[PDB]
Design a protein around this ligand. Structure first.
Ligand SMILES: Nc1nc2c(ncn2[C@@H]2O[C@H](COP(=O)(O)OP(=O)(O)O)[C@@H](O)[C@H]2O)c(=O)[nH]1
Ligand SMILES: [Ca+2]
Length: 144
């Protein structure tokens, strides 16, 4: 059974933990391992948060401009650590259930395009896009 080691990075308070708990325990309110079938393949998702992960969720919150601006720092670190320019990763805009949006989707898309990675909006609260975020990351790992 294939095992994907996933890392979630981003400013504190963006919902990294909430996203993980929503994926694993299916609810909104230290490593994690969930067995799941993705595209017919039975696999094991190992969510840490580098050192060394196979895929990285770069998370910010759409109601938090600074967390968005900090994303670049996080990716640069990952690139240095992995000694590579092409690391499987997804840009995640969390808390999309909130009305106080200060980061437009277009902004994140442009950033993601510059990185050559997908952008997905999530809500650990409503569960919107959570599975899609992690699953999409796995599919990015499979292309690598
Ligand atoms: N409304 C809303 N709140 C969220 C969402 N994700 C996380 N939160 C809240 O944001 C706060 C900090 O989230 P947390 O997971 O601890 O951030 P972390 O530092 O990245 O782990 C908590 O009170 C969460 O309930 C979301 O998608 N929507
Ligand atoms: Ca917390």
């Amino acid at each position: 059974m294939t095992e994907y080691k996933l890392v979630v990075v981003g400013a504190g308070g963006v919902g990294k933990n909430a996203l993980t708990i929503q994926l694993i325990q299916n609810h909104f309110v230290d490593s994690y391992r969930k067995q799941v079938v993705i595209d017919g393949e039975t696999c094991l998702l190992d969510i840490l948060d580098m050192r060394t992960g196979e895929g990285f969720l770069c998370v910010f919150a759409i109601n938090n401009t600074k967390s968005f601006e900090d994303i670049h720092q996080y990716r640069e670190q990952i690139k240095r650590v992995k000694d590579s320019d092409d690391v499987p990763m997804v840009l995640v805009g969390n808390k999309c259930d909130l009305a106080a949006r200060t980061v437009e989707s277009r902004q994140a898309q442009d950033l993601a395009r510059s990185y050559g990675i997908p952008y997905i909006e999530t809500s650990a609260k409503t569960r919107q896009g959570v599975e899609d975020a992690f699953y999409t990351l796995v599919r990015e790992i499979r292309q690598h």
